[PDB]
Amino acid sequence: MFHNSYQAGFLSILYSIGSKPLQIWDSQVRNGHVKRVTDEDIQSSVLEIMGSNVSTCYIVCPANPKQTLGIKLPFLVMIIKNMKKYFSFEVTILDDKNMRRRFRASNYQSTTKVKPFICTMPMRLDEGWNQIQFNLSDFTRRAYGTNYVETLRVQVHANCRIRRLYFSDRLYAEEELPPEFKL
Amino acid sequence: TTLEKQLQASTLSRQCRVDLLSHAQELERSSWGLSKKMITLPDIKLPPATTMSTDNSVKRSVNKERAQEYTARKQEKEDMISS
Amino acid sequence: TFSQLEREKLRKDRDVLPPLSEGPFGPFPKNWHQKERDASKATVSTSASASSILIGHTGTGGMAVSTFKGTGCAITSLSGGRFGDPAGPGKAGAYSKQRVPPTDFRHHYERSDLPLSIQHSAKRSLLWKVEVSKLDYHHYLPIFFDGLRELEEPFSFLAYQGSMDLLEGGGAKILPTVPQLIMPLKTALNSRHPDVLRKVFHVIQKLVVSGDHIGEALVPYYRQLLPVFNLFMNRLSSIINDTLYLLERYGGPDAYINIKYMVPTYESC
Amino acid sequence: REIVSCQAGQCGNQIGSKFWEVISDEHGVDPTGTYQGDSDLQLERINVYFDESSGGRYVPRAVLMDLEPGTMDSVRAGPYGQLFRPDNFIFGQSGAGNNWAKGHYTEGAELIDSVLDVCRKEAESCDCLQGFQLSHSLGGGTGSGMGTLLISKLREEYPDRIMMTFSVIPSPRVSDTVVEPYNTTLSVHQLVENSDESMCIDNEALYDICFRTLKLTTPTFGDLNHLVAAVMSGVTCCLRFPGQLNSDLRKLAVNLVPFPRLHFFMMGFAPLTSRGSQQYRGLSVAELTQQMFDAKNMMQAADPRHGRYLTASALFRGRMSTKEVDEQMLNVQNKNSSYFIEWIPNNIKSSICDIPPKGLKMSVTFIGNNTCIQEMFRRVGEQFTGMFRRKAFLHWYTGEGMDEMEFTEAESNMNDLVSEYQQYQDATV
Amino acid sequence: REIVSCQAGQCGNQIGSKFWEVISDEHGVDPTGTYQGDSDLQLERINVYFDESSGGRYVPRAVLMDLEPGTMDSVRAGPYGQLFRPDNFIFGQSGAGNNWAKGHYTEGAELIDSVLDVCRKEAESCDCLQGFQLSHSLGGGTGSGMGTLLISKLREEYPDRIMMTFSVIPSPRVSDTVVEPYNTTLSVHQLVENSDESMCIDNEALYDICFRTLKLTTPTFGDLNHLVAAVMSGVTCCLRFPGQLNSDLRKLAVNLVPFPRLHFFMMGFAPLTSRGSQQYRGLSVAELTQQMFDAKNMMQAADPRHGRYLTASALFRGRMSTKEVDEQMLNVQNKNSSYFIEWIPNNIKSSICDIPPKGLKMSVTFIGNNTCIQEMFRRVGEQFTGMFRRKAFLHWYTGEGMDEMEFTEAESNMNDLVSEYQQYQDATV
Amino acid sequence: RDDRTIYQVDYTPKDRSVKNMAGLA
Ligand SMILES: Nc1nc2c(ncn2[C@@H]2O[C@H](COP(=O)(O)OP(=O)(O)O)[C@@H](O)[C@H]2O)c(=O)[nH]1
Ligand SMILES: Nc1nc2c(ncn2[C@@H]2O[C@H](COP(=O)(O)OP(=O)(O)O)[C@@H](O)[C@H]2O)c(=O)[nH]1
Ligand SMILES: [Mg+2]
């Protein structure tokens, strides 16, 4: 959707402060729930997604499957809270040879593996709030030997607590981050 | 079952259902217009013993709603015949 | 009118709640008091004595057609493949509220034995005639825990805030009383009521955090308290999850297994 | 293609027992349930009336009913008693007491549940059944009451399938009780809109069949029941055996029911020869048709002079040519067309089956829908008016939960049926 | 895969003894221990239940246990009583007095040491033991009181082995003691915690099957005992004989136990018919399915129509194909889907064994984990609370060293089990 | 009373030897 829009510096795809934060997100919910709660750690309202099955219930951007994102920014930064439970996220990107390559990171994964469409990784999350940084271009080069063009879709599964998802062009420092991107 | 309920539960088209219904109602209208033998009724000045009874018979006695339903169905029946 | 809303909620819950107190003081005497001078009676005997039809005129006579299905086939069980009616068995009622038997904290409260009183402010507080840390915990704490099943004022607030105070203060006097705090918590949890459940959840978090080895002593008694947690964490979910997190955190190594054995849909903290 | 049968009352049970004896003889089934027939045609369609068990025994598709267990014991102790399934013997402790009310509302209801359980079990056990048969007497208590209740419940449950009932309407000259009017009326006004087709039986006609056609010495109820059994076998023969001109119960229903309420049929059999005159007469299609249309050959006692055939149906069995079995139907339709109606032309349905009843090279069963069948209804209605006008014997029926309105409605329906039969009795040209 | 069996109490002793009778009959074992079977398959897997001696005698792998000495003499007086090993006959000088306390704490404990000794002696002889089977009644004193302690210590010693128990649940309208609720409440939580799978027997249901399913005039304990032995032997049909779809005790437990608490099962057997209708009934696997899922055919007295099915298990026996052993389960599933839990698709485990029970061409055993098992304990808890409110009949238990807190905890445990069944009855996807 | 397994009844030593040598000739 962002093909014709400005893509430089920062581009937030999800933010727990907007009036209706899920405008561009499809809350595919099954035996779970997506809701805005008040976190005691930060005294602020954040997205809060629960589900017995991590795969069935999730939120995916864009909502329309035919529609797709157009973000060129190679870095994806996610401020998510480790709920001490199974968590996963999915990022579909378009490579230079025009394949949709699908990078997944989960905490229940054992070891990383690469398959002709997917690249699954395990994650280790510290207790409390976490700032996961995902370098799409570097990991695409590492796992596929292929240039990164732009990301098509982001789908973070259930069973987690989410503050803000934003793409950045370079590895911004904590001090260099804007005040609204802080925690 | 009554015919109306039977066709309500059956698998005809609506036009076919109303056609069979109309056939039956017209047959019954012709039957009504046909001549009969009068439905006989109990006589006047009937013996009292025909009505008043004994304690044995009241021991072997095992309805208002049933009679009301009968009368309502009859009344709608002659209303349809008149119409 | 928030007072009206609370009143209406208690009116709806009356049929399942324990019988309400007959006033601020106690049950009224039956057929009590006497008239000032009354009006005498003299009534004479006469005035005292005065004080499936089947209509053969409609039906399917000679019209056996292939397009007819029977009526009552879907009601007549045992026909074929049906060992029961299509309506199905009724609701189990596990989710529905269950009758709450009367509390002993009630009777101990109409008896002038509780050493706590009410002080009025923005939120009412508790004034204790005797300092908390020198109470007979083995005698008093189970009473307050059993009082959690009360909802009508003031008994509900008395029990709730008394439990909170007796867990905030007391220290090592709470651990020996753990085995006898399970039955009142069991009766409170079986009430199947969201308000009682929330109060019990807050009480259990306070109990777990108040002292040392409290979680260790509660671990062997997970057989009793967890069924309601499992029942209501899927239909309150957040507070149940918080209670489970605290229980696992302060329960030691056996807490994980003892929560897995009762709540299949649980994860480590 | 199969029919499951029920017997109600003592009369119905005896008639059904004789019918099952006849069917077992035709299909080569001895009382122990085995098969000793000497033809493949007996086994090719034995599933119409019999169900094979694990051991190969052929259990009849029969449901027996009577509040009196005496007839249950008698039928199970009879020569063919072991044939029937033990669980199909459904009976009560106290009899119907010759009371339609007792057999339809008080005692019949408490047993009709298990009766329907058994019938439903049999119907679903077998594959795809043509319909239900019932045998009973309208002058009885449980044959009329429970029989009509069974018919009503089976119309509730299986309206898809055909319904055929053999009702033995009593006659004043054979009347062995006093409540024939009440029972017969309370049963017929049920069967008018409940039974799909109801052919009539009269013991008065059964007696003089044994005289004007058989000239036999001692006629008994068992002797009478064989006529009903033979006509049942001729009616359902074509489903069990091949034929040049095939037919089944739905075919007869379509060809004999011009209007839904006109489904009461007058029935007969041929040949009916005596032992003395057996060799004297030369049996042929002409004689068979003449005996079919002979007034005295009918096994229902209503005079066919006073009525006109709405429709007729001849079900021939044996080895005969087709043009002379249709030409004799043409012959009667021409010779005595005054029996017939003009608005329905060519009133005769015909069927040919290659297998005749045992002991016949040619045979035929005749089922006629005539405007004369209302004679029995008129006589029973006259007796009913005589009894009901003075409220005689009505306390028995009113003490079993029934009201006078049921009798009033029964009389109204009987009068309507009589009138709609009498519509076409006039000999218009 | 050797199952080792134990029978506790008088009820347990008789049930196990005749169960060994049935096992010997189906394996061709002479009551004197010799083998007379006509099939090699009987001896192929006879080591599951029997141990061969030096002389070829097949001794049952059973432990007979009860505090009363007379029951050992009665069992030996039984026709197959000479089959058991004499040292397995272990008994106390004084009986339990129908007291759970006496059977569990004072008199049972002093002899449970020898019980465990003989149990371990028999367990060590098996190369790969499958598990421990127990047969007892929860209404008795020594069958329940000491049987539960036996189950607990066998759980302690052998955790992985499959623990099956047959608990004859007492009930009010056939009650013959005043402390059935006491014993049952004191035994239920041990059965819950220490048994892999505890399946229930109710005398009203066994007796009802005898009256109406078997239509035999005077049922005895022998008859109910035969009924339960049928399924008792049938549950290990795949263990003892080959089949198209083999199974075993742990596979059944896995397919029937979704959660550790939910392991209480109903009972089921088919075919069951009267002697007079043995040859009339057409034995088929479809009829087997219909009867097995029929509520009355259950030999536990709690209507399955009042609850929902967690899982079901159908162990069919006899030569059969797969059409109506899977499509019939599918048909009952999608026709009574209102009676089956949605979040467990295809609740029915189906297993096939080729060898049919002796005297039957085809049979089936049913294991149902319905939610209606909570109706087991509704009435038991009501009666227990009725007795416990006024503290009656409790001095007998408290004089043997038991505390009132254990009774209160037993109440709490039964209530927890009932609520656990209720929540999965009304649980939604 | 047949105790043969389904393996035995369906799985039988199958002989392809000619029963009728007249057709072969
Ligand atoms: N044809 C024939 N008629 C019978 C037989 N038994 C009784 N009937 C007639 O049935 C009438 C009595 O009916 P009943 O047996 O009492 O009917 P139920 O009460 O329903 O059993 C008598 O008038 C007899 O003429 C029989 O075996 N054959
Ligand atoms: N099915 C069946 N039940 C029995 C038998 N013997 C006793 N019972 C039941 O067991 C209960 C009494 O058990 P009891 O003999 O006191 O057990 P014990 O105390 O361990 O010896 C009664 O309610 C009976 O219904 C039997 O042979 N078969
Ligand atoms: Mg296997």
Side-chain angles (χ1 to χ4, degrees):
Chain A
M1 65 184 73
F2 294 119
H3 281 277
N4 290 20
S5 176
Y6 193 60
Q7 293 179 356
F10 286 123
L11 188 55
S12 175
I13 62 170
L14 190 152
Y15 194 11
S16 304
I17 301 315
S19 54
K20 188 269 183 181
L22 298 176
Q23 274 286 109
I24 48 182
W25 294 78
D26 189 358
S27 89
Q28 185 61 255
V29 175
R30 262 176 161 279
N31 263 277
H33 62 83
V34 188
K35 62 177 71 174
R36 264 151 61 61
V37 305
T38 76
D39 191 340
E40 297 91 5
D41 285 333
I42 68 178
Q43 303 170 300
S44 179
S45 85
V46 298
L47 270 296
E48 190 276 332
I49 305 168
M50 291 335 307
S52 56
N53 296 115
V54 62
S55 67
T56 76
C57 53
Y58 55 86
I59 50 160
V60 55
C61 175
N64 168 302
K66 293 184 286 186
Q67 186 177 182
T68 193
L69 290 162
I71 310 148
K72 55 182 301 313
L73 306 186
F75 285 72
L76 165 70
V77 187
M78 294 182 286
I79 310 165
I80 63 156
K81 172 147 165 208
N82 189 359
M83 302 267 299
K84 278 322 192 212
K85 294 202 271 223
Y86 302 145
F87 163 78
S88 174
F89 74 77
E90 182 65 26
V91 174
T92 62
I93 64 162
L94 184 66
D95 59 13
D96 69 2
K97 293 188 288 293
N98 290 318
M99 284 74 74
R100 292 187 284 270
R101 293 281 161 61
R102 255 191 290 121
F103 293 61
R104 187 190 265 289
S106 44
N107 73 17
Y108 53 70
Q109 196 57 252
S110 63
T111 53
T112 197
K113 66 179 72 66
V114 179
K115 296 183 290 294
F117 292 114
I118 310 163
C119 183
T120 70
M121 283 73 74
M123 61 175 38
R124 183 179 182 178
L125 294 200
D126 310 89
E127 190 191 0
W129 274 101
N130 290 318
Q131 173 144 260
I132 290 180
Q133 305 206 70
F134 196 21
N135 174 347
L136 294 175
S137 159
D138 166 63
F139 279 167
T140 309
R141 288 173 183 265
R142 222 167 78 184
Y144 285 128
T146 300
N147 287 116
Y148 168 60
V149 173
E150 61 86 20
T151 187
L152 299 178
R153 174 181 301 81
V154 173
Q155 173 203 140
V156 60
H157 282 279
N159 193 48
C160 66
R161 193 89 63 96
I162 284 176
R163 171 59 180 212
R164 183 208 265 269
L165 270 74
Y166 64 98
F167 291 82
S168 68
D169 52 354
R170 54 181 211 71
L171 185 64
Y172 279 94
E174 192 177 1
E175 317 173 359
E176 296 177 353
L177 277 187
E180 69 275 16
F181 288 67
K182 294 280 191 174
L183 183 63
Chain B
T1 61
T2 46
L3 192 53
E4 293 179 353
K5 287 174 208 94
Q6 185 58 306
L7 282 71
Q8 266 305 327
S10 174
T11 59
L12 271 43
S13 56
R14 193 257 306 159
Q15 170 50 11
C16 191
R17 289 178 182 177
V18 67
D19 269 354
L20 183 63
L21 183 63
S22 179
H23 177 67
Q25 313 214 310
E26 293 293 328
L27 261 183
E28 211 66 0
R29 186 179 295 275
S30 78
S31 310
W32 174 272
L34 183 63
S35 170
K36 280 73 176 175
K37 151 208 181 180
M38 182 179 72
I39 297 161
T40 61
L41 294 174
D43 291 331
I44 297 169
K45 309 155 198 175
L46 183 63
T50 62
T51 81
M52 61 66 78
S53 169
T54 74
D55 291 331
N56 297 357
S57 305
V58 311
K59 302 317 201 318
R60 313 291 201 240
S61 66
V62 309
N63 297 1
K64 291 174 70 175
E65 293 179 353
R66 185 132 71 72
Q68 293 179 356
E69 293 179 353
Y70 177 37
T71 53
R73 293 180 181 177
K74 294 302 291 303
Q75 183 66 41
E76 66 183 1
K77 174 162 291 303
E78 292 84 4
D79 291 331
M80 152 204 78
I81 301 299
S82 66
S83 178
Chain C
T1 316
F2 300 90
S3 79
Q4 171 216 350
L5 277 296
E6 294 294 328
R7 183 176 176 87
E8 182 65 26
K9 186 180 289 293
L10 277 296
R11 296 294 86 193
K12 299 192 191 96
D13 268 9
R14 156 186 200 110
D15 291 331
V16 67
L17 282 194
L20 292 93
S21 59
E22 293 83 3
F25 284 113
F28 263 101
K30 304 181 179 181
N31 300 120
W32 84 108
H33 268 165
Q34 285 182 357
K35 304 290 98 175
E36 179 179 359
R37 73 279 192 190
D38 209 353
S40 70
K41 295 296 291 182
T43 299
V44 68
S45 58
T46 60
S47 66
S49 60
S51 180
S52 293
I53 284 294
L54 181 163
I55 300 300
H57 204 263
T58 185
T60 62
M63 305 187 294
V65 187
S66 283
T67 52
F68 287 1
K69 296 184 290 294
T71 58
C73 317
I75 316 171
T76 42
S77 172
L78 186 62
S79 180
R82 303 210 290 290
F83 59 95
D85 72 41
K91 293 182 183 293
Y95 292 159
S96 61
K97 294 181 176 67
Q98 296 294 321
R99 184 68 172 78
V100 192
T103 62
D104 291 331
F105 177 56
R106 194 81 81 81
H107 312 321
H108 292 171
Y109 183 63
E110 292 84 4
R111 300 151 83 259
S112 314
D113 278 328
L114 273 296
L116 82 173
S117 175
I118 301 299
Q119 258 190 334
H120 294 89
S121 285
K123 42 172 185 291
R124 30 177 170 180
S125 178
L126 285 183
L127 190 137
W128 301 78
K129 272 77 72 177
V130 65
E131 190 276 331
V132 180
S133 66
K134 57 176 62 64
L135 265 290
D136 201 337
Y137 266 44
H138 279 78
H139 163 54
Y140 275 102
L141 195 56
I143 297 169
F144 275 95
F145 269 29
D146 186 74
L148 288 170
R149 314 181 290 151
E150 292 292 328
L151 280 73
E152 65 183 1
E153 303 298 326
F155 314 90
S156 166
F157 168 75
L158 271 295
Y160 186 42
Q161 188 63 255
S163 61
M164 294 296 172
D165 291 331
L166 286 170
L167 273 296
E168 183 178 1
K173 314 172 61 43
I174 297 169
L175 183 57
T177 62
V178 164
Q180 56 186 21
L181 291 180
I182 301 299
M183 187 66 204
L185 279 190
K186 182 67 181 294
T187 78
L189 285 155
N190 306 139
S191 68
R192 214 71 51 71
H193 194 294
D195 291 331
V196 181
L197 285 188
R198 194 161 300 81
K199 293 187 286 185
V200 165
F201 301 153
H202 287 307
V203 163
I204 198 158
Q205 322 204 50
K206 182 67 181 294
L207 163 76
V208 165
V209 65
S210 291
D212 192 0
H213 315 308
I214 302 298
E216 294 293 328
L218 279 181
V219 160
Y221 294 81
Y222 283 171
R223 178 70 274 172
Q224 273 74 350
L225 285 79
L226 277 296
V228 190
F229 296 2
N230 175 37
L231 168 63
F232 286 97
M233 65 179 288
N234 283 319
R235 184 176 176 87
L236 212 64
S237 295
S238 48
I239 190 167
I240 297 169
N241 285 357
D242 291 331
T243 55
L244 279 179
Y245 291 159
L246 277 194
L247 261 61
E248 183 178 1
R249 177 96 43 76
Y250 290 168
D254 291 331
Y256 181 76
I257 294 91
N258 290 318
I259 301 299
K260 274 322 310 173
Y261 182 76
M262 292 276 318
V263 172
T265 182
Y266 185 64
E267 291 82 3
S268 296
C269 65
Chain D
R1 294 301 291 310
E2 68 275 15
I3 297 169
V4 65
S5 76
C6 295
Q7 316 157 9
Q10 183 257 332
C11 182
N13 273 294
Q14 287 216 8
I15 292 176
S17 67
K18 184 62 71 83
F19 158 80
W20 279 114
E21 293 179 353
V22 172
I23 288 299
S24 296
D25 211 19
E26 293 179 353
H27 283 341
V29 175
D30 56 331
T32 190
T34 60
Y35 166 82
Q36 285 70 58
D38 54 354
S39 182
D40 189 359
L41 305 195
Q42 282 153 314
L43 294 174
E44 66 183 1
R45 294 271 150 61
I46 209 168
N47 56 356
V48 174
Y49 283 110
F50 303 103
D51 173 279
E52 53 182 0
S53 173
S54 59
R57 185 191 274 237
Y58 284 110
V59 178
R61 297 183 155 87
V63 183
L64 294 96
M65 294 182 286
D66 188 358
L67 300 195
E68 306 172 2
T71 192
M72 272 315 102
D73 291 331
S74 86
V75 67
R76 68 184 68 188
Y80 281 66
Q82 199 66 18
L83 208 60
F84 301 118
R85 224 185 296 259
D87 63 358
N88 278 20
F89 293 88
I90 301 299
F91 45 99
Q93 320 294 326
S94 67
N98 207 6
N99 208 320
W100 192 90
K102 184 182 311 323
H104 200 89
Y105 281 155
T106 65
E107 294 293 328
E110 310 206 356
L111 183 63
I112 203 66
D113 291 331
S114 47
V115 160
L116 276 296
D117 189 358
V118 164
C119 313
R120 199 171 303 113
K121 184 178 184 293
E122 184 66 27
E124 290 198 0
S125 77
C126 189
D127 297 334
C128 182
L129 61 84
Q130 181 99 39
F132 290 76
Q133 189 181 4
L134 171 79
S135 57
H136 56 106
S137 173
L138 303 183
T142 177
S144 69
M146 185 180 288
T148 43
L149 189 58
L150 176 80
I151 294 298
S152 71
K153 293 313 191 33
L154 272 62
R155 293 305 312 270
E156 294 293 328
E157 182 65 26
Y158 314 102
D160 186 74
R161 280 133 187 70
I162 203 65
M163 185 64 72
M164 182 179 71
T165 185
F166 288 74
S167 66
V168 184
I169 297 89
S171 167
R173 294 150 101 160
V174 176
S175 171
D176 78 347
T177 62
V178 299
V179 286
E180 293 83 3
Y182 294 151
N183 295 331
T184 316
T185 312
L186 289 171
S187 60
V188 296
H189 80 280
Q190 296 294 321
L191 306 152
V192 171
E193 62 296 340
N194 284 271
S195 72
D196 291 331
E197 60 204 14
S198 171
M199 51 215 68
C200 292
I201 301 299
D202 206 347
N203 276 359
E204 174 186 355
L206 290 178
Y207 291 166
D208 45 5
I209 280 175
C210 312
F211 289 160
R212 297 171 177 180
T213 59
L214 304 175
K215 265 294 171 53
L216 59 86
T217 302
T218 62
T220 63
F221 280 135
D223 177 355
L224 296 197
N225 296 348
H226 175 252
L227 292 151
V228 189
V231 187
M232 293 180 183
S233 66
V235 162
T236 72
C237 80
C238 189
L239 293 94
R240 316 176 268 124
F241 304 116
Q244 301 176 189
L245 197 57
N246 286 330
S247 70
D248 63 358
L249 277 296
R250 218 169 310 269
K251 275 162 91 43
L252 282 71
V254 170
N255 285 315
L256 290 161
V257 179
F259 304 103
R261 304 205 45 229
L262 319 182
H263 59 77
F264 288 85
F265 305 140
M266 65 180 288
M267 59 189 319
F269 191 44
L272 273 297
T273 179
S274 76
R275 199 49 169 277
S277 67
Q278 174 265 344
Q279 75 274 17
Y280 264 91
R281 64 190 52 267
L283 277 300
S284 70
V285 189
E287 311 309 306
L288 271 294
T289 306
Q290 183 62 255
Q291 220 169 354
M292 281 165 28
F293 288 89
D294 189 358
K296 55 180 65 63
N297 197 19
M298 311 275 148
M299 65 180 288
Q300 61 90 5
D303 187 35
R305 321 292 94 208
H306 300 99
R308 294 164 74 214
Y309 282 70
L310 272 180
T311 42
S313 74
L315 295 174
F316 281 88
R317 316 177 46 163
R319 195 52 42 68
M320 61 225 68
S321 165
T322 313
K323 82 160 292 295
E324 293 83 3
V325 75
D326 291 331
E327 190 276 331
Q328 300 285 16
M329 311 315 317
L330 180 55
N331 202 75
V332 297
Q333 183 62 255
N334 274 43
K335 301 290 94 175
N336 63 359
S337 66
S338 279
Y339 296 7
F340 298 96
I341 52 174
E342 293 83 3
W343 51 287
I344 297 169
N346 207 317
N347 302 107
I348 281 152
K349 174 52 181 33
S350 279
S351 83
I352 294 297
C353 182
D354 313 288
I355 296 311
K358 304 162 81 43
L360 278 297
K361 307 276 291 292
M362 293 180 183
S363 166
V364 65
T365 48
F366 174 52
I367 310 182
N369 192 14
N370 189 306
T371 56
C372 82
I373 191 167
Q374 46 81 27
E375 267 196 338
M376 65 183 73
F377 300 143
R378 274 221 321 290
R379 74 181 51 270
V380 169
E382 287 196 355
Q383 301 192 106
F384 184 93
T385 57
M387 296 200 71
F388 188 45
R389 194 211 291 300
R390 298 305 289 272
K391 304 282 291 323
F393 295 91
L394 206 71
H395 72 276
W396 295 108
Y397 294 64
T398 55
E400 308 284 347
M402 209 162 46
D403 56 354
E404 293 179 354
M405 301 331 302
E406 262 296 338
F407 287 87
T408 301
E409 182 65 26
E411 183 178 1
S412 178
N413 197 15
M414 201 166 203
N415 297 321
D416 291 331
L417 180 75
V418 166
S419 306
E420 63 184 0
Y421 291 165
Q422 287 190 301
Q423 268 186 301
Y424 313 110
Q425 84 179 342
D426 315 330
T428 64
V429 179
Chain E
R1 318 199 309 292
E2 309 59 34
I3 192 66
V4 65
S5 75
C6 314
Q7 43 267 22
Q10 188 274 331
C11 179
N13 264 7
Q14 293 180 356
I15 189 176
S17 178
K18 68 180 178 66
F19 171 71
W20 278 109
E21 293 179 354
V22 175
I23 297 286
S24 312
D25 200 305
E26 65 183 1
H27 276 287
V29 184
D30 189 358
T32 61
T34 61
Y35 168 79
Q36 270 81 9
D38 291 331
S39 67
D40 189 359
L41 310 186
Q42 282 161 311
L43 272 188
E44 183 178 1
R45 303 292 189 184
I46 210 166
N47 64 7
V48 177
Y49 280 79
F50 290 99
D51 281 327
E52 65 183 1
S53 310
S54 66
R57 191 193 197 95
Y58 296 102
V59 179
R61 206 185 276 98
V63 177
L64 286 76
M65 77 183 278
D66 181 339
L67 291 184
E68 301 175 2
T71 181
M72 321 285 148
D73 265 20
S74 71
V75 170
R76 301 200 60 55
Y80 284 65
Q82 295 297 108
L83 192 61
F84 309 105
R85 219 192 307 281
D87 63 358
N88 289 15
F89 285 83
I90 61 171
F91 63 91
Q93 294 295 321
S94 173
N98 195 327
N99 200 322
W100 195 92
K102 294 181 176 67
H104 193 92
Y105 281 107
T106 58
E107 182 65 26
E110 293 179 353
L111 188 153
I112 207 61
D113 186 46
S114 66
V115 186
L116 265 292
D117 194 6
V118 64
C119 182
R120 278 196 296 276
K121 184 177 180 180
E122 293 179 353
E124 287 181 352
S125 65
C126 314
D127 60 338
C128 182
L129 183 137
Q130 180 66 256
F132 304 93
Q133 175 182 266
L134 186 60
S135 52
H136 66 276
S137 173
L138 295 188
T142 187
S144 67
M146 174 161 50
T148 55
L149 191 151
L150 184 67
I151 284 190
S152 71
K153 291 175 71 175
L154 272 63
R155 170 59 44 177
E156 293 179 353
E157 293 180 355
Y158 306 87
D160 56 339
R161 309 295 96 212
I162 290 298
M163 200 80 39
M164 184 180 288
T165 177
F166 304 81
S167 66
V168 180
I169 308 295
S171 47
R173 64 181 291 276
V174 307
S175 175
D176 59 12
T177 313
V178 298
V179 292
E180 294 90 359
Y182 280 166
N183 308 336
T184 307
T185 316
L186 288 171
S187 308
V188 158
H189 54 284
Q190 287 78 11
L191 285 199
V192 166
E193 293 179 353
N194 302 115
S195 178
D196 282 272
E197 65 183 1
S198 51
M199 71 186 48
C200 295
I201 301 299
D202 200 355
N203 280 188
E204 292 83 3
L206 277 296
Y207 278 136
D208 186 74
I209 284 180
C210 286
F211 280 133
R212 68 180 68 186
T213 307
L214 300 181
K215 293 182 183 293
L216 59 86
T217 62
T218 61
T220 72
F221 276 135
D223 301 358
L224 318 177
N225 284 348
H226 182 74
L227 287 174
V228 55
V231 65
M232 263 195 68
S233 82
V235 65
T236 64
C237 65
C238 295
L239 276 166
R240 291 175 285 102
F241 297 117
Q244 282 176 179
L245 197 150
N246 291 317
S247 70
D248 62 357
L249 295 175
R250 190 192 300 297
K251 174 182 301 263
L252 298 179
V254 164
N255 286 266
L256 286 153
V257 178
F259 315 96
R261 264 71 50 80
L262 291 90
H263 67 88
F264 282 69
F265 306 143
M266 272 166 298
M267 282 325 317
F269 192 61
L272 284 176
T273 175
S274 65
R275 65 181 294 275
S277 65
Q278 183 66 41
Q279 73 268 40
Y280 294 83
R281 212 168 149 211
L283 181 60
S284 75
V285 64
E287 294 293 328
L288 284 200
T289 299
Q290 188 274 331
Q291 190 189 2
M292 152 192 78
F293 265 106
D294 189 358
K296 296 183 290 294
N297 179 92
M298 300 265 179
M299 69 212 86
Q300 188 275 330
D303 196 322
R305 282 167 268 155
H306 298 165
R308 215 171 299 267
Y309 271 109
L310 273 296
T311 43
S313 179
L315 284 86
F316 283 86
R317 279 173 66 117
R319 184 173 289 78
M320 40 167 65
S321 178
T322 300
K323 299 289 94 175
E324 290 85 357
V325 71
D326 291 331
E327 190 276 331
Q328 279 306 94
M329 315 288 114
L330 189 148
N331 189 359
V332 69
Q333 275 282 128
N334 60 7
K335 185 170 318 311
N336 298 287
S337 68
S338 51
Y339 286 56
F340 287 99
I341 285 177
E342 293 83 3
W343 40 278
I344 309 173
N346 189 358
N347 299 108
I348 295 160
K349 174 33 181 293
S350 172
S351 66
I352 305 164
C353 190
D354 303 357
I355 296 300
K358 197 158 279 177
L360 291 178
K361 186 180 289 293
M362 294 182 286
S363 164
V364 58
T365 61
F366 186 78
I367 301 299
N369 195 11
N370 197 278
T371 50
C372 66
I373 300 292
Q374 73 210 7
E375 162 208 357
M376 202 67 29
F377 309 133
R378 213 61 61 61
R379 65 183 180 179
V380 171
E382 293 179 353
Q383 292 186 141
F384 182 86
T385 49
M387 287 197 291
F388 200 55
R389 184 175 314 122
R390 314 264 310 288
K391 305 322 310 313
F393 285 102
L394 183 63
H395 75 273
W396 290 121
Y397 293 86
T398 57
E400 302 295 327
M402 189 170 329
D403 196 331
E404 183 178 1
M405 185 180 288
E406 183 178 1
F407 284 92
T408 64
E409 294 294 328
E411 293 179 353
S412 296
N413 287 338
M414 221 186 288
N415 290 352
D416 291 331
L417 188 59
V418 167
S419 303
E420 172 91 347
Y421 271 129
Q422 288 271 72
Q423 65 182 357
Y424 293 129
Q425 176 175 351
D426 63 358
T428 66
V429 300
Chain F
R1 176 89 207 168
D2 297 358
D3 291 331
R4 284 201 330 300
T5 71
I6 287 160
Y7 182 48
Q8 293 178 357
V9 310
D10 299 347
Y11 281 93
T12 300
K14 295 152 191 169
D15 301 0
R16 326 171 210 181
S17 66
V18 298
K19 307 176 180 179
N20 192 2
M21 201 95 68
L24 263 292

